[PDB]
DNA sequence: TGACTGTATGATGACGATGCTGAC
DNA sequence: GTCAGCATCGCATCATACAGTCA
């Protein structure tokens, strides 16, 4: 059978709903943005956002406002979601507690009652006492607001005009007034009802009825000092009370639809427009006084402001800030001007948000890192189209890198404070030393007085007091600043070598031999404290004295080599206190105990790269929640120190690691680097918050990227991309991609705007071909904005457009392979595409075009038209597999470089998806479902093996293995097919069977199997089977992987029991949001696994964990294992989280 | 004017007409202007692709109700490629119900008027299997499928027993028990969601069963016979009769009861013979006797959206024609029965299968070939809407592309 | 003695297959 | 003979008329 699960990579970026007021507090105001299944908080500051919550929910964020009851003492968040669960929720916070309390929930709908086409839409009045929903057509949903009802209940009362464009709520009406715009057929109207909730029902508006306009799309309710709706369609926007009404039609709207709106100023002054292309409109309302004072309005103005990103919402917030939200683009917070600049505009960007989304094809691609890469790219459609880099862990690049063999450490230091950093570098070789002074990029080592040559130390850097400290494998030294000298200096009895360390700035430990002999520090020179004895020879040492600085520690950390065992020490009285021993002959190596955000922390690192790691009180000193985490195998070096806003602690090795904490748990990022050795911090004037690297073979010194766990490096294209696909004997990437062009007059069409293509270094131009078109085309230049379709040759490194090829005029380009067929050593890009005109809705003729590449030039080959669409395409034994219209032609390459017809499959009504496995291919059509073919190599033809039975209108289509089928469909559920693997008759074995269901909330345009994460190095065997990743609509990545029958059925109990504790939000049960649900059924999950609700286990608090674990004996089977499942569930869904 | 103005868009992109005919054609305009003759190259040049609007929806900005309105006239441009008639399969005693097989695409069932099923599947050869009946009053009026097993199928029969009978022709028990002989039932569905049966007789009351035993039922639903029941697959616990009275009737099951107690009621003009629920659940589909087709909503059950006219009369031995919707898509098949009394655009008005839009009630196809002008009362599209199974009198057709 | 509802009878409209003649 | 043109037979509704109960 089926066990399947699927968990959230990278949330989603596109932001859909946005709303500002005062949610956390009065004197705070707040932004909130919601991305689909995301609610995110802001609080603006002085030219700074800051975030606060980041809170999930069980749904689509379909209406998201927020409104202030009478006497409440703050601001509700009225939230509806897109399965019709309505939320009233409050926010709160008790210290370092926040969470998002829900005053009053329910489900309301209609049980039966068709959607209406423009969506949903809710109000809830100015004077916040009932919320207007339009869910269905002839009916209006009201929802009584009190408090009362906390379970939300509705009624739905009768609205006879079947066709509403936009709804609002009025201002200072005397009684709750709703204003909507309908359409019939003498033209669409605007219109008033009272909504009485008395005897439940409207009354008679304050309005006689209109004719407004003829294409009027929104509604805008005008607060006081007026009244009334100002009405905005396209060509015209309209204002309208009672008895006055204003009108105009500046032409400088007929280009593009205005499809937001925002208020500026609370008083209604002033409106913020935005349209499809970007454009930022101010629109602003003069008020009129009579005599001392009366109130009314003489026109309007528009003045044009400038252009944004694509605006799907957009919110002014204070001093000339506006943040626009994007569906197609980035978002941005945008800063507005008096004074236009060069250009024009007004506007000026701040800061840019990443947006992933649309994400319409992405493709795992291995390069950089030879062995694996990881690197996931993608694609962000229009004029923020654009390619995203996405690759785990973190990267840093080598400025400077003079090569150098055989280094053991190396330390920074600067004598002198009046700069105010740290210079002069050292590094050690075998037996060693050699001291290497800082002035720009250039080291060498010149000569320091005083500096001990011929010794080797492990101590070296400024320290307190006006000083540098440097001990060596033979002694104790310390070096003097003003005379540059060595006042005091300290040997052991015997004359013997220094082995174990530890040191810090106000105090420190040498050891030698065995004991630790203890040291500690008084202004240039020593008095030693008492003596050690304890237990033979000592693994390493660390003294680091938790704190600001500090730098004196209470505080001892060491290691053992026959116990095996980090102890913890009291100072100076030592005394052993917790014992934990260690299984295994290895030994401990890099102690330390780190600092961040309020947490203590300690870590130690043995042999196999292995590492434990504890939460600590520093009170007791005692050690607890105990666990460890394997890496690698190469030994692990253990610095710390700090960079921007956050702290660090990182492991050095060959997959070279770091360790943080995330909202209070911790993180481990892996970095890029090979190999990593010794390296310090080096935070200089020349160099602000940097590092150096000492490596094997050379050093490497650089500035680190951003602070995240996912990067993510962007290469806008100014236009949208459609497929892509990776050359790797090119080095360089395929773009299926178009502009919009529109009518020169003169001919041609002039284009737009410069973007990618056009600024190709070589190009190339179709040519004709015959359609045929021939013999007076006659077509029009009628139906204006035309699309120019391109293919793209894209360097994998510089990622410069090498190549730009443009299509035929009216062709559209559908499909994109890379590969080589035949006999023949060449490796294609091959493309199908359409032919798409104005008089026919279906495409007739398309092409299947061959491409291969040298030097910048970018020849043609096969060229091959063909009578439909190629939807589809893919490389398959050596022979191109492809999907035109209702035909499933298998294509085969020969050597006189033409395109050959092997075989067909004419059983389909439109085959846009195929996939392949081995002799498989599954093909997934818009209308008839899914449906699995195989070959044969001596026969040719197409048997059909079996097929789903049930309709399902499918986004994409993926091959799990060679028996199970994953399918996305358009109401964004998942399913899985699986052929009968029982003989028995040819009847069920002809039939696929849906044996998963799964409801993903997202709409999936793109599967790929692949991985961003490296192999192992323990534990093989692997706890999941394969990764399928998915990219969609709303730029979200999530990954599908099989499951083994002990593992579904123990996260299936599992889940049910983090289903009694979460909390919810919204009160909205998972089992109820899984379900599978479209516009004809609604039917529970089943075969599939909400990762995201196993791995949010880790952070309930240890309480909660104890109330299922003690319980989750209930079930968990016998060997070796009980009630130490519950840190095997932790070190389960630890194995769960680095699949990803 | 407005419906030839919201057709080609379909909507977005938004951009292209908007004009509202010109801002107005002066009023059509009168005499010559247009008209409904150069409604054509418009239409011919509708949605302009699908590959882009399906790239639009690909993109998110295309709402879902948008495409599959356009997907639709991807949908009828080879319903008119469907004029081919792969199979005929007949048998005597005339063709009276017609039931689909809910799992499979290949496989239907026909009844008879003297008794006699037939279990027919195709892509086999291997020959349909068959049960024989009585040939008198063995008349069968509304046929289903049993959702559990396949294999099995209930049935109401003018021999007075609404069974549960398999295709091997072995009875599994029965139902309803008459014990007269004067009454017989015309109508019967069931439900795999909420777990029921129901039939209604030509006395106009009716009976509600569980798939085991429980009798709840029984109550006078109307005066004379009940023509047809259906069962509400998104709601289920609704239910919906449409009978002769000139009256549907609903009810929601459940609460109400107590005779005269029933929500809703709609009265018509003339008797009926369909209700038919749709597949979401909201729309009913009444279909009259005379001409006339009408369809409610779900917001006011009371007021129908809008009547399409439509020859299809009654007759002593013309299988009663019922329309019904298509799964997938808000589309409107029925069979045509001409008549010499109306207002008819087309002469001279022949015999063939209509095809309307549930949102317009415009004629957007019609189905006929030679070789057989029988009249078709029964069509019903397949669960997967890639055929048609017409019944039509003797003989059985199959609607296809190939 | 009003009501409601159920009994062997009749006019009738006009589809199918089945079948028989005469008249090409 | 295959094909044209009439009889002939295969419990649906709207309208009459008497009983039958039910209550």
Same mark, same amino acid.
């Given at each position: 059978?089926?066990?399947?699960?699927?968990?959230?990579?990278?949330?989603?970026?596109?932001?859909?709903?946005?709303?500002?007021?005062?949610?956390?507090?009065?004197?705070?105001?707040?932004?909130?943005?919601?991305?689909?299944?995301?609610?995110?908080?802001?609080?603006?500051?002085?030219?700074?956002?800051?975030?606060?919550?980041?809170?999930?929910?069980?749904?689509?964020?379909?209406?998201?406002?927020?409104?202030?009851?009478?006497?409440?003492?703050?601001?509700?968040?009225?939230?509806?979601?897109?399965?019709?669960?309505?939320?009233?929720?409050?926010?709160?916070? /008790?210290?370092?507690?926040?969470?998002?309390? *829900?005053?009053?929930?329910?489900?309301?709908?209609?049980?039966?009652?068709?959607?209406?086409?423009?969506?949903?839409?809710?109000?809830?009045?100015?004077?916040?006492?009932?919320?207007?929903?339009?869910?269905?057509?002839?009916?209006?949903?009201?929802?009584?607001?009190?408090?009362?009802?906390?379970?939300?209940?509705?009624?739905?009362?009768?609205?006879?005009?079947?066709?509403?464009?936009?709804?609002?709520?009025?201002?200072?009406?005397?009684?709750?007034?709703?204003?909507?715009?309908?359409?019939?057929?003498?033209?669409?109207?605007?219109?008033?009802?009272?909504?009485?909730?008395?005897?439940?029902?409207?009354?008679?508006?304050?309005?006689?009825?209109?004719?407004?306009?003829?294409?009027?799309?929104?509604?805008?309710?005008?607060?006081?000092?007026?009244?009334?709706?100002?009405?905005?369609?396209?060509?015209?926007?309209?204002?309208?009370?009672?008895?006055?009404?204003?009108?105009?039609?500046?032409?400088?709207?007929?280009?593009?639809?205005?499809?937001?709106?925002?208020?500026?100023?609370?008083?209604?002054?002033?409106?913020?427009?935005?349209?499809?292309?970007?454009?930022?409109?101010?629109?602003?309302?003069?008020?009129?006084?009579?005599?001392?004072?009366?109130?009314?309005?003489? !026109?309007?103005?528009?003045?044009?402001?400038?252009?944004?990103?694509?605006?799907?919402?957009?919110?002014?917030?204070?001093?000339?800030?506006?943040?626009?939200?994007?569906?197609?683009?980035?978002?941005?917070?945008?800063?507005?001007?008096?004074?236009?600049?060069?250009?024009?505009?007004?506007?000026?960007?701040?800061?840019?948000?990443?947006?992933?989304?649309?994400?319409?094809?992405?493709?795992?691609?291995?390069?950089?890192?030879?062995?694996?890469?990881?690197?996931?790219?993608?694609?962000?459609?229009?004029?923020?189209?654009?390619?995203?880099?996405?690759?785990?862990?973190?990267?840093?690049?080598?400025?400077?890198?003079?090569?150098?063999?055989?280094?053991?450490?190396?330390?920074?230091?600067?004598?002198?404070?009046?700069?105010?950093? !740290?210079?002069?570098?050292?590094?050690?070789?075998?037996?060693?030393?050699?001291?290497?002074?800082?002035?720009?990029?250039?080291?060498?080592?010149?000569?320091?007085?005083?500096?001990?040559?011929?010794?080797?130390?492990?101590?070296?850097?400024?320290?307190?007091?006006?000083?540098?400290?440097?001990?060596?494998?033979?002694?104790?030294?310390?070096?003097?600043?003003?005379?540059?000298?060595?006042?005091?200096?300290?040997?052991?009895?015997?004359?013997?070598?220094?082995?174990?360390?530890?040191?810090?700035?106000?105090?420190?430990?040498?050891?030698?031999?065995?004991?630790?002999?203890?040291?500690?520090?008084?202004?240039?020179?020593?008095?030693?404290?008492?003596?050690?004895?304890?237990?033979?020879?000592?693994?390493?040492?660390?003294?680091?004295?938790?704190?600001?600085?500090?730098?004196? /520690?209470?505080?001892?950390?060491?290691?053992?080599?026959?116990?095996?065992?980090?102890?913890?020490?009291?100072?100076?009285?030592?005394?052993?206190?917790?014992?934990?021993?260690?299984?295994?002959?290895?030994?401990?190596?890099?102690?330390?105990?780190?600092?961040?955000?309020? /947490?203590?922390?300690?870590?130690?690192?043995?042999?196999?790269?292995?590492?434990?790691?504890?939460?600590?009180?520093?009170?007791?000193?005692?050690?607890? !929640?105990?666990?460890?985490?394997?890496?690698?195998?190469?030994?692990?070096?253990?610095?710390?120190?700090?960079?921007?806003?956050?702290?660090?602690?990182?492991?050095?090795?060959?997959?070279?690691?770091?360790?943080?904490?995330?909202?209070?748990?911790?993180?481990?990022?892996?970095?890029?680097?090979?190999?990593?050795?010794?390296?310090?911090?080096?935070?200089? !004037?020349?160099?602000?918050?940097?590092?150096?690297?000492?490596?094997?073979?050379?050093?490497?010194?650089?500035?680190?990227?951003?602070?995240?766990?996912?990067?993510?490096? *962007?290469?806008?294209?100014?236009?949208?991309?459609?497929?892509?696909?990776?050359?790797?004997?090119?080095?360089?990437?395929?773009?299926?991609?178009?502009?919009?062009?529109?009518?020169?007059?003169?001919?041609? *069409?002039?284009?737009?705007?410069?973007?990618?293509?056009?600024?190709?270094?070589?190009?190339?131009?179709?040519?004709?071909?015959?359609?045929?078109?021939?013999?007076?085309?006659?077509?029009?230049?009628?139906?204006?904005?035309?699309?120019?379709?391109?293919?793209?040759?894209?360097?994998?490194?510089?990622?410069?457009?090498?190549?730009?090829?443009?299509?035929?005029?009216?062709?559209?380009?559908?499909?994109?392979?890379?590969?080589?067929?035949?006999?023949?050593?060449?490796?294609?890009?091959?493309?199908?595409?359409?032919?798409?005109?104005?008089?026919?809705?279906?495409?007739?003729?398309?092409?299947?075009?061959?491409?291969?590449?040298?030097?910048?030039?970018?020849?043609?080959?096969?060229?091959?038209?063909?009578?439909?669409?190629?939807?589809?395409?893919?490389?398959?034994?050596?022979?191109?597999?492809?999907?035109?219209?209702?035909?499933?032609?298998?294509?085969?390459?020969?050597?006189?470089?033409?395109?050959?017809?092997?075989?067909?499959?004419?059983?389909?009504?439109?085959?846009?998806?195929?996939?392949?496995?081995?002799?498989?291919?599954?093909?997934?059509?818009?209308?008839?479902?899914?449906?699995?073919?195989?070959?044969?190599?001596?026969?040719?033809?197409?048997?059909?093996?079996?097929?789903?039975?049930?309709?399902?209108?499918?986004?994409?289509?993926?091959?799990?293995?060679?028996?199970?089928?994953?399918?996305?469909?358009?109401?964004?559920?998942?399913?899985?097919?699986?052929?009968?693997?029982?003989?028995?008759?040819?009847?069920?074995?002809?039939?696929?069977?849906?044996?998963?269901?799964?409801?993903?909330?997202?709409?999936?345009?793109?599967?790929?199997?692949?991985?961003?994460?490296?192999?192992?190095?323990?534990?093989?065997?692997?706890?999941?089977?394969?990764?399928?990743?998915?990219?969609?609509?709303?730029?979200?990545?999530?990954?599908?992987?099989?499951?083994?029958?002990?593992?579904?059925?123990?996260?299936?109990?599992?889940?049910?029991?983090?289903?009694?504790?979460?909390?919810?939000?919204?009160?909205?049960?998972?089992?109820?949001?899984?379900?599978?649900?479209?516009?004809?059924?609604?039917?529970?999950?089943?075969?599939?696994?909400?990762?995201?609700?196993?791995?949010?286990?880790?952070?309930?608090?240890?309480?909660?964990?104890?109330?299922?674990?003690?319980?989750?004996?209930?079930?968990?089977?016998?060997?070796?294992?009980?009630?130490? *499942?519950?840190?095997?569930?932790?070190?389960?869904?630890?194995?769960?989280?680095?699949?990803? | 004017?407005?419906?030839?103005?919201?057709?080609?868009?379909?909507?977005?992109?938004?951009?292209?007409?908007?004009?509202?005919?010109?801002?107005?054609?002066?009023?059509?305009?009168?005499?010559?202007?247009?008209?409904?003759?150069?409604?054509?190259?418009?239409?011919?040049?509708?949605?302009?692709?699908?590959?882009?609007?399906?790239?639009?929806?690909?993109?998110?900005?295309?709402?879902?109700?948008?495409?599959?309105?356009?997907?639709?006239?991807?949908?009828?441009?080879?319903?008119?490629?469907?004029?081919?008639?792969?199979?005929?399969?007949?048998?005597?005693?005339?063709?009276?119900?017609?039931?689909?097989?809910?799992?499979?695409?290949?496989?239907?069932?026909?009844?008879?008027?003297?008794?006699?099923?037939?279990?027919?599947?195709?892509?086999?050869?291997?020959?349909?299997?068959?049960?024989?009946?009585?040939?008198?009053?063995?008349?069968?009026?509304?046929?289903?499928?049993?959702?559990?097993?396949?294999?099995?199928?209930?049935?109401?029969?003018?021999?007075?027993?609404?069974?549960?009978?398999?295709?091997?022709?072995?009875?599994?028990?029965?139902?309803?028990?008459?014990?007269?002989?004067?009454?017989?039932?015309?109508?019967?569905?069931?439900?795999?969601?909420?777990?029921?049966?129901?039939?209604?007789?030509?006395?106009?009351?009716?009976?509600?069963?569980?798939?085991?035993?429980?009798?709840?039922?029984?109550?006078?639903?109307?005066?004379?016979?009940?023509?047809?029941?259906?069962?509400?697959?998104?709601?289920?616990?609704?239910?919906?009769?449409?009978?002769?009275?000139?009256?549907?009737?609903?009810?929601?099951?459940?609460?109400?009861?107590?005779?005269?107690?029933?929500?809703?009621?709609?009265?018509?003009?003339?008797?009926?013979?369909?209700?038919?629920?749709?597949?979401?659940?909201?729309?009913?589909?009444?279909?009259?006797?005379?001409?006339?087709?009408?369809?409610?909503?779900?917001?006011?059950?009371?007021?129908?959206?809008?009547?399409?006219?439509?020859?299809?009369?009654?007759?002593?031995?013309?299988?009663?024609?019922?329309?019904?919707?298509?799964?997938?898509?808000?589309?409107?098949?029925?069979?045509?029965?001409?008549?010499?009394?109306?207002?008819?655009?087309?002469?001279?008005?022949?015999?063939?299968?209509?095809?309307?839009?549930?949102?317009?009630?415009?004629?957007?196809?019609?189905?006929?070939?030679?070789?057989?002008?029988?009249?078709?009362?029964?069509?019903?599209?397949?669960?997967?809407?890639?055929?048609?199974?017409?019944?039509?009198?003797?003989?059985?057709?199959?609607?296809?592309?190939?």
């Amino acid at each position: 059978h089926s066990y399947n699960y699927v968990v959230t990579a990278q949330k989603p970026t596109a932001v859909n709903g946005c709303v500002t007021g005062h949610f956390t507090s009065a004197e705070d105001l707040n932004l909130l943005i919601a991305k689909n299944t995301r609610l995110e908080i802001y609080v603006v500051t002085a030219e700074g956002l800051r975030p606060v919550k980041e809170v999930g929910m069980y749904g689509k964020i379909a209406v998201m406002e927020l409104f202030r009851p009478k006497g409440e003492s703050k601001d509700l968040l009225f939230i509806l979601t897109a399965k019709y669960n309505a939320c009233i929720l409050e926010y709160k916070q /008790s210290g370092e507690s926040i969470d998002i309390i *829900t005053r009053a929930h329910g489900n309301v709908q209609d049980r039966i009652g068709r959607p209406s086409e423009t969506g949903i839409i809710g109000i809830i009045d100015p004077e916040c006492r009932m919320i207007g929903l339009r869910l269905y057509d002839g009916l209006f949903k009201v929802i009584p607001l009190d408090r009362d009802n906390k379970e939300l209940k509705a009624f739905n009362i009768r609205l006879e005009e079947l066709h509403v464009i936009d709804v609002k709520f009025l201002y200072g009406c005397q009684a709750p007034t709703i204003c909507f715009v309908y359409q019939d057929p003498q033209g669409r109207h605007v219109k008033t009802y009272e909504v009485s909730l008395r005897e439940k029902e409207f009354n008679k508006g304050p309005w006689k009825q209109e004719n407004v306009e003829a294409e009027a799309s929104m509604v805008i309710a005008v607060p006081e000092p007026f009244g009334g709706a100002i009405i905005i369609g396209q060509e015209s926007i309209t204002y309208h009370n009672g008895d006055k009404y204003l009108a105009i039609a500046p032409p400088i709207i007929k280009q593009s639809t205005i499809v937001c709106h925002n208020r500026v100023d609370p008083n209604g002054s002033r409106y913020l427009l935005g349209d499809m292309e970007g454009r930022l409109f101010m629109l602003l309302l003069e008020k009129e006084e009579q005599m001392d004072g009366t109130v009314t309005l003489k !026109d309007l103005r528009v003045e044009l402001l400038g252009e944004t990103s694509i605006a799907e919402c957009l919110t002014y917030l204070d001093n000339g800030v506006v943040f626009v939200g994007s569906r197609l683009g980035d978002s941005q917070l945008v800063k507005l001007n008096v004074d236009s600049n060069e250009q024009g505009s007004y506007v000026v960007a701040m800061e840019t948000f990443t947006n992933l989304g649309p994400i319409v094809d992405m493709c795992v691609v291995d390069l950089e890192r030879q062995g694996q890469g990881q690197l996931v790219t993608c694609s962000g459609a229009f004029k923020e189209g654009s390619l995203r880099i996405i690759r785990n862990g973190i990267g840093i690049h080598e400025h400077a890198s003079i090569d150098l063999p055989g280094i053991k450490g190396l330390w920074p230091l600067r004598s002198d404070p009046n700069r105010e950093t !740290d210079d002069t570098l050292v590094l050690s070789f075998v037996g060693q030393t050699r001291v290497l002074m800082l002035n720009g990029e250039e080291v060498e080592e010149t000569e320091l007085m005083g500096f001990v040559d011929d010794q080797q130390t492990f101590f070296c850097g400024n320290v307190a007091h006006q000083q540098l400290i440097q001990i060596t494998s033979a002694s104790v030294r310390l070096v003097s600043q003003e005379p540059k000298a060595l006042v005091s200096e300290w040997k052991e009895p015997q004359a013997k070598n220094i082995s174990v360390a530890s040191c810090n700035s106000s105090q420190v430990v040498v050891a030698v031999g065995r004991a630790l002999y203890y040291l500690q520090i008084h202004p240039q020179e020593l008095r030693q404290i008492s003596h050690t004895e304890m237990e033979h020879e000592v693994a390493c040492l660390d003294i680091t004295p938790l704190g600001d600085s500090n730098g004196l /520690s209470p505080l001892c950390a060491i290691g053992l080599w026959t116990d095996i065992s980090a102890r913890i020490l009291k100072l100076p009285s030592f005394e052993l206190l917790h014992k934990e021993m260690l299984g295994g002959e290895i030994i401990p190596r890099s102690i330390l105990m780190t600092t961040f955000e309020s /947490s203590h922390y300690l870590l130690c690192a043995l042999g196999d790269g292995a590492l434990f790691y504890f939460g600590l009180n520093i009170e007791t000193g005692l050690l607890s !929640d105990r666990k460890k985490v394997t890496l690698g195998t190469q030994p692990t070096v253990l610095r710390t120190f700090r960079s921007l806003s956050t702290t660090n602690v990182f492991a050095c090795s060959d997959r070279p690691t770091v360790i943080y904490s995330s909202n209070h748990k911790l993180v481990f990022s892996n970095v890029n680097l090979k190999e990593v050795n010794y390296m310090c911090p080096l935070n200089s !004037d020349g160099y602000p918050d940097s590092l150096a690297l000492a490596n094997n073979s050379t050093l490497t010194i650089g500035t680190i990227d951003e602070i995240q766990k996912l990067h993510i490096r *962007t290469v806008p294209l100014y236009e949208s991309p459609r497929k892509i696909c990776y050359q790797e004997v090119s080095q360089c990437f395929g773009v299926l991609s178009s502009r919009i062009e529109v009518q020169d007059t003169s001919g041609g *069409t002039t284009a737009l705007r410069p973007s990618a293509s056009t600024q190709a270094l070589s190009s190339s131009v179709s040519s004709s071909k015959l359609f045929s078109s021939s013999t007076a085309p006659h077509e029009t230049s009628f139906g204006e904005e035309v699309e120019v379709h391109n293919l793209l040759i894209i360097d994998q490194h510089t990622f410069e457009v090498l190549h730009a090829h443009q299509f035929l005029q009216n062709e559209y380009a559908l499909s994109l392979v890379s590969c080589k067929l035949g006999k023949d050593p060449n490796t294609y890009f091959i493309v199908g595409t359409a032919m798409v005109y104005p008089e026919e809705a279906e495409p007739k003729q398309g092409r299947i075009v061959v491409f291969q590449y040298s030097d910048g030039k970018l020849q043609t080959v096969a060229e091959k038209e063909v009578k439909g669409a190629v939807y589809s395409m893919v490389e398959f034994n050596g022979k191109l597999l492809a999907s035109i219209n209702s035909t499933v032609r298998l294509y085969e390459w020969t050597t006189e470089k033409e395109l050959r017809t092997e075989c067909n499959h004419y059983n389909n009504i439109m085959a846009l998806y195929l996939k392949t496995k081995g002799d498989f291919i599954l093909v997934g059509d818009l209308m008839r479902s899914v449906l699995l073919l195989a070959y044969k190599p001596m026969e040719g033809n197409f048997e059909e093996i079996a097929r789903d039975f049930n309709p399902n209108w499918m986004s994409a289509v993926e091959i799990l293995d060679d028996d199970n089928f994953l399918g996305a469909e358009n109401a964004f559920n998942l399913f899985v097919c699986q052929k009968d693997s029982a003989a028995t008759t040819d009847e069920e074995r002809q039939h696929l069977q849906e044996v998963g269901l799964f409801h993903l909330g997202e709409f999936v345009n793109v599967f790929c199997h692949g991985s961003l994460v490296m192999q192992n190095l323990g534990e093989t065997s692997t706890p999941t089977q394969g990764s399928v990743l998915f990219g969609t609509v709303n730029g979200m990545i999530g990954l599908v992987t099989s499951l083994s029958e002990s593992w579904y059925n123990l996260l299936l109990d599992m889940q049910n029991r983090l289903n009694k504790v979460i909390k919810s939000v919204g009160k909205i049960e998972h089992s109820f949001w899984r379900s599978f649900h479209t516009e004809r059924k609604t039917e529970p999950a089943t075969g599939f696994i909400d990762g995201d609700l196993i791995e949010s286990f880790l952070d309930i608090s240890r309480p909660k964990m104890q109330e299922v674990v003690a319980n989750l004996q209930y079930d968990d089977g016998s060997g070796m294992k009980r009630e130490a *499942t519950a840190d095997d569930l932790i070190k389960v869904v630890e194995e769960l989280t680095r699949i990803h | 004017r407005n419906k030839r103005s919201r057709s080609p868009l379909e909507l977005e992109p938004e951009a292209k007409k908007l004009c509202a005919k010109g801002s107005g054609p002066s009023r059509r305009c009168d005499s010559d202007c247009l008209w409904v003759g150069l409604a054509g190259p418009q239409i011919l040049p509708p949605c302009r692709s699908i590959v882009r609007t399906l790239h639009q929806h690909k993109l998110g900005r295309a709402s879902w109700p948008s495409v599959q309105q356009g997907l639709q006239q991807s949908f009828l441009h080879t319903l008119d490629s469907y004029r081919i008639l792969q199979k005929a399969a007949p048998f005597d005693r005339r063709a009276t119900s017609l039931a689909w097989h809910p799992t499979h695409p290949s496989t239907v069932a026909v009844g008879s008027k003297g008794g006699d099923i037939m279990l027919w599947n195709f892509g086999i050869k291997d020959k349909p299997t068959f049960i024989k009946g009585i040939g008198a009053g063995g008349s069968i009026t509304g046929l289903k499928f049993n959702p559990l097993n396949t294999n099995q199928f209930y049935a109401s029969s003018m021999e007075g027993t609404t069974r549960l009978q398999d295709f091997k022709g072995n009875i599994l028990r029965v139902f309803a028990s008459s014990d007269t002989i004067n009454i017989w039932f015309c109508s019967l569905d069931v439900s795999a969601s909420s777990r029921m049966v129901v039939t209604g007789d030509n006395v106009g009351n009716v009976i509600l069963l569980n798939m085991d035993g429980k009798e709840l039922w029984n109550l006078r639903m109307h005066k004379k016979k009940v023509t047809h029941v259906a069962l509400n697959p998104c709601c289920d616990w609704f239910l919906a009769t449409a009978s002769v009275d000139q009256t549907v009737k609903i009810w929601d099951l459940r609460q109400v009861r107590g005779k005269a107690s029933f929500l809703y009621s709609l009265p018509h003009r003339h008797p009926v013979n369909a209700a038919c629920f749709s597949p979401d659940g909201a729309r009913l589909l009444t279909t009259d006797q005379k001409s006339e087709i009408r369809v409610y909503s779900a917001s006011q059950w009371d007021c129908p959206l809008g009547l399409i006219p439509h020859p299809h009369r009654h007759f002593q031995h013309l299988t009663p024609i019922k329309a019904a919707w298509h799964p997938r898509y808000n589309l409107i098949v029925v069979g045509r029965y001409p008549d010499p009394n109306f207002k008819s655009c087309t002469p001279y008005e022949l015999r063939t299968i209509d095809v309307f839009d549930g949102n317009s009630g415009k004629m957007m196809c019609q189905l006929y070939d030679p070789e057989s002008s029988g009249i078709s009362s029964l069509n019903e599209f397949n669960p997967m809407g890639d055929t048609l199974a017409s019944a039509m009198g003797y003989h059985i057709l199959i609607w296809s592309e190939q």
